[PDB]
Amino acid sequence: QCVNLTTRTQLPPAYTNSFTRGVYYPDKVFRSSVLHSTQDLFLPFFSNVTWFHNPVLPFNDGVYFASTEKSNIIRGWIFGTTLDSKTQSLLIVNNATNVVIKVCEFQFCNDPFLDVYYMKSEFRVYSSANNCTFEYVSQPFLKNLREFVFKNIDGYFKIYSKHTPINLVRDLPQGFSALEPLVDLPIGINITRFQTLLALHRSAAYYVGYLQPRTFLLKYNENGTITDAVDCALDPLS
Amino acid sequence: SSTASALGKLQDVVNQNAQALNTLVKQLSSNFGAISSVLNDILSRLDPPEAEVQIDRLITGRLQSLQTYVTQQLIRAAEIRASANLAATKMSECVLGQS
Amino acid sequence: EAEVQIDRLITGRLQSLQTYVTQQLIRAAEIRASANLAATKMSECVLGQS
Amino acid sequence: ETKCTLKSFTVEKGIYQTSNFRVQPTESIVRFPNITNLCPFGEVFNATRFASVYAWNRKRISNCVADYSVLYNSASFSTFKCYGVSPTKLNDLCFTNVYADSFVIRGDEVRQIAPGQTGKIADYNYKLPDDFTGCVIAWNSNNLDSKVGGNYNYRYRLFRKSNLKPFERDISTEIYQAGSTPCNGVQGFNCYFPLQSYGFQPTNGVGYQPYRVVVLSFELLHAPATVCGPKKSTNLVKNKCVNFNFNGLTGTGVLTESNKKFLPFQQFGRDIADTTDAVRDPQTLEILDITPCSFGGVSVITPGTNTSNQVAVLYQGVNCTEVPVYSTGSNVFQTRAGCLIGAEHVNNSYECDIPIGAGICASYQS
Amino acid sequence: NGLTGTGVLTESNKKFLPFQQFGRDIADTTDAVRDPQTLEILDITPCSFG
Amino acid sequence: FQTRAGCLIGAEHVNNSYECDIPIGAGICASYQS
Amino acid sequence: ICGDSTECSNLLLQYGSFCTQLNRALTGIAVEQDKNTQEVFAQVKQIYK
Amino acid sequence: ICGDSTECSNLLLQYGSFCTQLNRALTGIAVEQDKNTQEVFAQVKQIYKTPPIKDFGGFNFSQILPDPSKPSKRSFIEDLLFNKVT
Amino acid sequence: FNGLTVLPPLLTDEMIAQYTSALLAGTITSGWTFG
Numbered sequence A: 001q002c003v004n005l006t007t008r009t010q011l012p013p014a015y016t017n018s019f020t021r022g023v024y025y026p027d028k029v030f031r032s033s034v035l036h037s038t039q040d041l042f043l044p045f046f047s048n049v050t051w052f053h054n055p056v057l058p059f060n061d062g063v064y065f066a067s068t069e070k071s072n073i074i075r076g077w078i079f080g081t082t083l084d085s086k087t088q089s090l091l092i093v094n095n096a097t098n099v100v101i102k103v104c105e106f107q108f109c110n111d112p113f114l115d116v117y118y119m120k121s122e123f124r125v126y127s128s129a130n131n132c133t134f135e136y137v138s139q140p141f142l143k144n145l146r147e148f149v150f151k152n153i154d155g156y157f158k159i160y161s162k163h164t165p166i167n168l169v170r171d172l173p174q175g176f177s178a179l180e181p182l183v184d185l186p187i188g189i190n191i192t193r194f195q196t197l198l199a200l201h202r203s204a205a206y207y208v209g210y211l212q213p214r215t216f217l218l219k220y221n222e223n224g225t226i227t228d229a230v231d232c233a234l235d236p237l238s
Numbered sequence B: 001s002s003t004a005s006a007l008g009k010l011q012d013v014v015n016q017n018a019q020a021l022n023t024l025v026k027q028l029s030s031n032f033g034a035i036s037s038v039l040n041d042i043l044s045r046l047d048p049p050e051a052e053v054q055i056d057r058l059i060t061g062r063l064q065s066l067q068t069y070v071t072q073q074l075i076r077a078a079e080i081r082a083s084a085n086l087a088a089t090k091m092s093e094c095v096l097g098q099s
Numbered sequence C: 001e002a003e004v005q006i007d008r009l010i011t012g013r014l015q016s017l018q019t020y021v022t023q024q025l026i027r028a029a030e031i032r033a034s035a036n037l038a039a040t041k042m043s044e045c046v047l048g049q050s
Numbered sequence D: 001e002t003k004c005t006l007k008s009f010t011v012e013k014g015i016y017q018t019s020n021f022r023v024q025p026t027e028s029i030v031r032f033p034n035i036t037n038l039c040p041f042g043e044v045f046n047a048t049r050f051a052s053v054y055a056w057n058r059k060r061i062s063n064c065v066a067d068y069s070v071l072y073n074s075a076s077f078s079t080f081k082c083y084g085v086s087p088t089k090l091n092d093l094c095f096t097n098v099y100a101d102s103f104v105i106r107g108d109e110v111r112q113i114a115p116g117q118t119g120k121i122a123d124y125n126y127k128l129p130d131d132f133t134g135c136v137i138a139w140n141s142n143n144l145d146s147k148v149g150g151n152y153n154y155r156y157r158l159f160r161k162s163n164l165k166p167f168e169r170d171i172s173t174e175i176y177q178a179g180s181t182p183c184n185g186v187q188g189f190n191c192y193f194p195l196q197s198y199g200f201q202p203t204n205g206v207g208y209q210p211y212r213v214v215v216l217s218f219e220l221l222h223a224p225a226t227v228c229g230p231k232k233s234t235n236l237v238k239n240k241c242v243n244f245n246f247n248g249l250t251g252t253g254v255l256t257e258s259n260k261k262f263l264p265f266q267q268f269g270r271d272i273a274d275t276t277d278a279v280r281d282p283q284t285l286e287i288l289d290i291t292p293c294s295f296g297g298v299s300v301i302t303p304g305t306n307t308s309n310q311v312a313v314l315y316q317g318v319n320c321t322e323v324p325v326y327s328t329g330s331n332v333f334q335t336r337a338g339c340l341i342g343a344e345h346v347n348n349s350y351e352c353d354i355p356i357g358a359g360i361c362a363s364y365q366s
Numbered sequence E: 001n002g003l004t005g006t007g008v009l010t011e012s013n014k015k016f017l018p019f020q021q022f023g024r025d026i027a028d029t030t031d032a033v034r035d036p037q038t039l040e041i042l043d044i045t046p047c048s049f050g
Numbered sequence F: 001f002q003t004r005a006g007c008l009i010g011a012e013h014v015n016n017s018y019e020c021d022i023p024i025g026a027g028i029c030a031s032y033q034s
Numbered sequence G: 001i002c003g004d005s006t007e008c009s010n011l012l013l014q015y016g017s018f019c020t021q022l023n024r025a026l027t028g029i030a031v032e033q034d035k036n037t038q039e040v041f042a043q044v045k046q047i048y049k
Numbered sequence H: 001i002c003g004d005s006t007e008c009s010n011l012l013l014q015y016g017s018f019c020t021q022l023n024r025a026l027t028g029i030a031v032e033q034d035k036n037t038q039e040v041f042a043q044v045k046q047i048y049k050t051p052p053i054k055d056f057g058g059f060n061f062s063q064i065l066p067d068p069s070k071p072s073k074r075s076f077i078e079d080l081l082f083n084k085v086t
Numbered sequence I: 001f002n003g004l005t006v007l008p009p010l011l012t013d014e015m016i017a018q019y020t021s022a023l024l025a026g027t028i029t030s031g032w033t034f035g
Ligand SMILES: *[C@@H]1O[C@H](CO)[C@@H](O[C@@H]2O[C@H](CO)[C@@H](O[C@@H]3O[C@H](CO)[C@@H](O)[C@H](O)[C@@H]3O)[C@H](O)[C@H]2NC(C)=O)[C@H](O)[C@H]1NC(C)=O
Pocket: D041, D042, D043, D045, D046, D070
C-alpha cells in the first residue's frame, strides 16, 4: 500500500574529491608496528565521489556510502536487480530499535517511504512479501559522519561501518579512519542495483562512491590500529 | 659525533644479512603447485596416496630455496673474509711500524 | 593441459636462469679482486717510487 | 656417539657435534565454544517424501554440531563416494555454510552424478561443477517408493534448448518444439511435453528400481568456521610444551599469559613472515602467547682418546631447567652458550685449550 | 598464414629466392615473412620496452 | 630531455658543470637546487 | 620465461619471490662495476695540463 | 622443510645426503668468522698498561685512552661508535 | 632482444682519457709531491 508523489524532486549530482577516505580492515589478524602490503578492492585515492542534495544506481563490484547525517533521517537500503516480486530482493531497515534484514521477493513501488506520525508507527514501503528467505535482527546502527562499505563476493554480503563526530560544514574531512567490520551475511544473490530509504514527514545530502581492485600499503601501530596508508598506483613516488 | 651515515659499510652488511634471512623465512608461505601452503592441513585433510605427491612438491620447492640461500651466504662469507685479511694486513703494517 | 606444458617450460627456464646468475656472480667477484689489485698497483707504482 | 659420527675408533682432542634434541609434547588440549545443538540429519536423511530430480531439494545448514560416524558406519548406503577429502577424516574438520541436496533417480543413473560427466540427467536436470568438493551418497528405495500399480509421481526433464550451467534449477513446463512448426501449447506431432515420468515397479530389475541420492557440498576457508565435528572440549594447561587445536587452528608450543591488547573482532595475530604468535581461546575470550618448544644441538668436549676417556656434554642455547642417564651426573653449569655438564667451574683464568664460547672454555686436569 | 606474433613491421630490402617463405636470423627467431597477397618481403622487430 | 641512456622527464637541463650527486649515466647526472 | 603471456605470469607468481631476488643481484653487480672504475681511475682532485 | 613430521622426514630420507653437506657449510662459515676476528685482533703476546701519570710531551690522549670510570672500560670514541650504529 | 638489456657506463672514455692525461702531466711535471 504505497502511492506515487506529485513533486518530482531533483537532487543535484555534485562531484567532489575523496582525499584519503575509504579504508577498511581487510582480515581478522592482529599486527603491531608493521608495514603490510595487500591487494584487494578499495576506493582509489583522490577519486570523484558523487553528492546528492532516491534514483536507482548500479551496485557493480562494491559501494561506499557516506552521510553527514543529523538526527538520523536515513533508515535503510534496498538491494536487487528488478526490485519486484519476480526476483529475490534484500531489504535493510534501521528504525529506533534493533535493525531488521529481510531477504524476500518484495513488491516495490516507485518511492518506498516509512512516514512519521505526530507514537511512531507506519510501514508501507512495499506492498506484498510472498516468499521470504532470510531474516536477521541485531543492534541498531544509529554532525554525525556515518561511513559504510558494502561488498558481495562468493555469496557473502560484507558490510563495514564507522561513526564519527564532525564539525565542518560541507567539505569531506581531510583525515584518516578505518572502517571496522560490521556484519557478514551468508546469502548468495545476484544484486546489481540499490536504493536509499527516507522517512518523510507524514505529519537528503550524502556521498557515494565505487570500488576498484588495486594494491595498498597499510601501517599498523603498536596497538594494532591502522594509522596510515599509501596507494600504489597513484604516483611515481607512490 | 655529529655527522650521520658515517658507518655505511657495517650497516649495509647487517641489512643484507637481515634481508636474506627475511626472504628465506618468507619463502615458506608458497604453494609451489600443491593445494595448500601448510603441511598439517594436507596431512589431516586427505588420504596419504596424494599426500605423498603434495609433500614431494613442498620438499622440492623448499630444497631449492634453501640451496639458493646457502650459495648466497657462501659468496658473502668469502667477500667478508677477503676484507678481514686486508684489515689484518693494515693492522700489522700501519700500527706496529711506519709504512 | 597447456598448464602442464607451461609448467615444464617454466621450471626448465627458471633453472637455466639461476645457473647463469650464479656464474655471473662468481665472475663479478673475480673481476672485482683484479680491479682492486690494479688500483693498488697504480696507487703505489705511479704516485711514487716502489 | 662421537666415534660413530666421526667414523673412527680414535678421536682427537676437541669439541664435536653429534646430533640435536627437542622438547617433546606431553599432552593435548582442545578448546571450542560451548555450543551443543545437534545438527539435523534425520530430517533430510530419514525424511518421508523426496522431491523429483528436476526439482532437487536444496537445504543450507550452518551453525550446528554434526556427526558423520552415524553416516559412515551404516551399511544401508549403496554408494558412499567423497571427492574433496578422505571419508574417515570428516570428523576432524570444521566448516560453515554447508549445502545438502536430495532427490530420487533411476537405479542405473547413479554413475551420471560425478564431476565432468555427461548423459541425460547430468546435462538437463543436475550438473556437478568441475571443481566440485564434497561427497555423494546413494542408496536403495525399492521397497519404499514402488507400488504394485507403479509410481508415476516422480518425473524428470527430457528436452531443453541447450545445456545447464552447474548448480541451476529449472522448473518451467513449456511445450518443446522439435520440428519446424509452432505448437501453440498443443501436444501433438513433433511437439512433446518436456517432462517424463518413471514406471517404478517391484518387478523391475536393477537399473530401474528407484534410488535415493543426497549430495553434500562443503567450503574451505571463507570465514570463521561454525559447522564443526564431534569434539569434546578440554581444560587449559599453561607453561608446558604441548600441542593445541584452538577452534581448528592447530600447532605445538608453549602457551603463556599475554599483555597484548586486541580489538573486539580478532581471534589471533602474527608478528612477521606469517608466524602466528597470539590466539584468543573461544571459551574464556583470553589472549595467550605461543612460544616454540626448546630445541638445540648437542656437543661433546673431549681431551683425546689417546689420554683419557671422560667427556663433557654441552647443550647449545638451552636454559639449564629442562635438560632431560646424564640428567644430573656431576656439577651442572649454566653459561651464556647454554648448559654444560661433566666439568667443574673455577675462578682461575688460563690459556684457552678447547674453545667453548661467550669468552669461556675448558681444559683437562678431570 | 598461421604464424602469429606481435611487433612492428617495416619494408625490407632483404633478397629472398622464390622458394623461401620466411627468414630467421638465429635462435629460431623469425625476422622476415612473405605475405601471400603481395609476395613482398617485410621485416618485423619487437615493440620497445624498458 | 633525451640522453644516450634514454629519455628523462620532469627535469630541466643546464649548461654548467658541477659535481655529481645522483649519477645517471653516459657521463651526465642530476642534482637539486628544482 | 613468459614472453608476455597472462597464463604464464599467473602460473609463475605462485612460485614465490624468486625473480625479485634474481633482479636484486644484477643491479648490485652494475653498481660494483661503476665503483670499481671510479676508484681505480679517479685518484686526483685537480685536472692538470 | 618438515616441521616435526614423520611422513615428511621419511619422504625426504630417500633423497640421499643433501642436508649433511647443506648443514656442514654454515659451521665452516662460523669458524671462519671466529678465526677472522682472532687473527685480526690477537696481535700481541702481553697486555700493556700506561703509567698512572700521563705527561706525553704535551699531546693530550684522554680521548682515546680507556675510561676506568665506565663499566664497559671503553674510551669516548669507542662508546660513540657503539651507540651511533643501530 | 627477448628481455635482455645493456646499460651504458657512467664514465665515458673521454673523461677516462682526461684522467690519464692529468695523471701523466702531474707525474712528469711535479714528480711525486702532487700525490
Ligand atoms: C534413521 O532411522 C534409523 C532407524 O531408527 C536409524 O538407525 C538406527 O539408529 C539408532 C540410533 O543411532 C541405532 O541405535 C543405536 O545402535 C547402536 C549400534 O547398534 C547401539 O550401540 C546403540 O545402543 C543404539 O541402540 C540403531 O542401531 C540404528 N539401526 C536400527 C536398525 O535401528 C538411523 O540412524 C536414522 N538416521 C538418521 C540420519 O536419522
